[PDB]
Amino acid sequence: TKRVAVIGAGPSGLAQLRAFQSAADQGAEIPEIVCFEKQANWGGLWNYTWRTGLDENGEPVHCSMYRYLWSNGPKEGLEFADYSFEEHFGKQIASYPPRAVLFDYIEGRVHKADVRKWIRFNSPVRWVSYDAETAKFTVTAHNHETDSTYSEDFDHVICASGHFSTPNVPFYEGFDTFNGRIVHAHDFRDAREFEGKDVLVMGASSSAEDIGSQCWKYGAKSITSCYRSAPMGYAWPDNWEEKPALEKLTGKTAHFADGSTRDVDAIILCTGYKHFFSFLPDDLRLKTANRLATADLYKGVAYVHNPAMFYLGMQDQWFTFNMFDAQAWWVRDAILGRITLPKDKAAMLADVAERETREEASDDVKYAIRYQADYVKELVAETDYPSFDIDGACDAFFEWKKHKAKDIMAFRDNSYKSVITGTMAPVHHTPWKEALDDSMEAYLQ
C-alpha cells in the first residue's frame, strides 16, 4: 500500500489526518499514514510549555505561545466546517476563547476521528531525502522514548511543521551590554515578569500588539513600542507610546530615529519568524517570505520542484483552522487521485506568480483578508470539504478589524455572528482586562 508521512501534529497535521480518515469512511482506500511529532502531545503552537530554548529532549522548543493568551481573532472565523463549536462544547461560548479552550476544541475533533493511533510523539524528523530511481522519500526520525533513530520510505511527504517557531532575532548596538531582559516573542511566557517595569516592544505586527497588550494588562509601568515601517497606529492607552525605529541602546537608554530617547527596563523582540526547516535538503526545502502567496507552492500546497511533497499552513494567516482544513482536503485528494497535478512545471510556477501578483495589487487590509478568503473558497470548491459561509467568516474579520480600530484594549469584549446560524455569540462574563484567570474551567464556568 502507498505510504504518506505527515510532519507535525499541530492544527495543520491534524487536519491532514482528519482528511484521510474522512475519506476512508466513505469507502475510499487510503495510504498508510504516519505522522511524526517532535512534542509529547499534539496541538502544535497551542500545546503550551513553560520551557524555552531547548526542550527536555534537547530539541528546539516549538511553542511560541505565552500565559494569558486568548484567541486573537473571532472564533467564528476559524470554526471547523465539519465539527462546530456547538457540537464540541454543547453550548454557545463567547468569541475569544483562551488558549486552553481552543486547544480542547482542536483535540476534540481528532479524538472523535480516532487518528491518534497514526501519530508518533517525541519523534522529531531528522531528515527527508528523495530518490527518483525508487520514487520514494526516505524519512529519518529520532524516537526519544527509546533514544533510537530509524528511517522509512514513503511515497509522499506532507510538511506541516509550522513557521512561527524559529525566531528572527536582530542585533542592535547595546543589546549585549543592556542591564535588562531581552527576549524574543518566541521565548516570552509570563507577562507578570514585567509588572511595574518600562517595557520596549520592538515590532508593529500581530505579536507586538498582543504581547504589548499582555504586559499592559498585567501591570507594566509603561509600554514603548517601536516601528521601522508603518506604525500600528491604534489609539493606545495613556502609558503606551509608539515610536519610530530603534537606533541603539546606550546603557538602558533607547535611542530612536527621530532623535528621542527613553529609558527602558526590558526589551521584547516581536520581530517575527523565519521559515526554517533544519531537516530538508536543497531540492526539497521551501524558501519563501511570510505572506499570503507562498513561494514555490502550487495551489499553495504542492512543492513545485517535487510535487509528491506538500506543505501545509506556510502562508501568513488571517484565516487559520478552516484554511488548513481546505489545504489538507486538497492535498489528500491530490494523493488519492481525485485531483491531478500538472505535469508542466511552467504551469505550476505560473500559478504561484499569479497569486503573488494578485496579493500585491493592493496593500489594503480588507483586500488582504478577502484575498485569503478567495484562496479558501478556491480550495474548498475543488474537494468534498463541507462548504461553509466564507463570506460570513470574512465579515467577522471585517468587524474584528473595526473593533480593534475603535478600542485596541477592549476588542476582545465583542461578539460575532456564527457562520452557521447567524446568531451573535454571547457576551463573556468578565471584561478582558479584568479576566486574569486563564483556565478553561474559569472560562466555561
Ligand X SMILES: Cc1cc2nc3c(=O)[nH]c(=O)nc-3n(C[C@H](O)[C@H](O)[C@H](O)COP(=O)(O)OP(=O)(O)OC[C@H]3O[C@@H](n4cnc5c(N)ncnc54)[C@H](O)[C@@H]3O)c2cc1C
Q: Is 138 in the site for ligand X (CB under 6 A)?
A: no
Phi, psi of 297 (to 5 degrees): -120, 105
Q: How many residues bind a second copy (CB under 8 A)?
A: 44
Q: How far apart are CA 44 and CA 8, in angstroms?
A: 7
Gyration radius of the chain's alpha carbons: 22
Q: How many residues bind ligand NAP (CB under 6 A)?
A: 21
Residues numbered 94-113 forming contacts with ligand NAP, rule: CB under 6 A:
none
Q: Is 220 helix (H, G, I), strand (E, B) or coil?
A: strand
Length of the chain: 445
Q: Is 196 in the site for a second copy (CB under 8 A)?
A: no
Q: Of the ranges 47-55, 86-94, 197-205, 392-400, which one interacts with a second copy (CB under 8 A)?
A: 47-55
In single-letter form, the type of residue at position 433 comes to: K
Site string for a second copy, 98-127 (x = CB under 8 A): ----------------------------xx
Is the CB of residue 266 less than 8 Å from the CB of residue 212?
no
Report which DSSP code applies to 296.
Answer: T
Instruction: State in angstroms the smallest separation of the CB of 45 from ligand NAP.
Output: 8
CB count, 10 Å around CB of 70? 20
Q: How far apart are CA 337 and CA 256, in angstroms?
A: 56
Query: Does the annotation list 445 as a binding residue?
Result: no
The interaxial angle of helices 365-380 and 345-360, nearest 10 deg, is 150
> What do you get for the CA distance between the two ends of the chain, in Å?
48
Q: How far apart are CA 256 and CA 328, in angstroms?
A: 45
Q: 118 vs 172, which CB is nearer to a second copy?
A: 172
Q: 138 vs 320, which CB is nearer to ligand X?
A: 320
Q: 63 vs 94, which CB is nearer to a second copy?
A: 63
Instruction: State in angstroms the smallest separation of the CB of 71 from ligand NAP.
Output: 8
Residues numbered 301-320 forming contacts with ligand X, rule: CB under 6 A:
312-313, 317, 320
Q: How far apart are CA 200 and CA 268, in angstroms?
A: 6
Site string for a second copy, 365-404 (x = CB under 8 A): ----------------------------------------
Q: Is 274 in the site for a second copy (CB under 8 A)?
A: yes
Q: How far apart are CA 39 and CA 315, in angstroms?
A: 22
Residue 270, contacted partner among ligand NAP, a second copy, ligand X, none, CB below 5-8 A by kind? ligand NAP
Q: Binding ligand X by CB under 6 A: which of 68, 85, 178, 279?
A: 279
Residue with cell 506556510: 314
Q: 244 vs 392, which CB is nearer to ligand X?
A: 392
Footprint of ligand NAP (CB under 6 A): 72, 164, 168, 170, 185, 202-208, 210, 228-229, 270-272, 290, 316-317
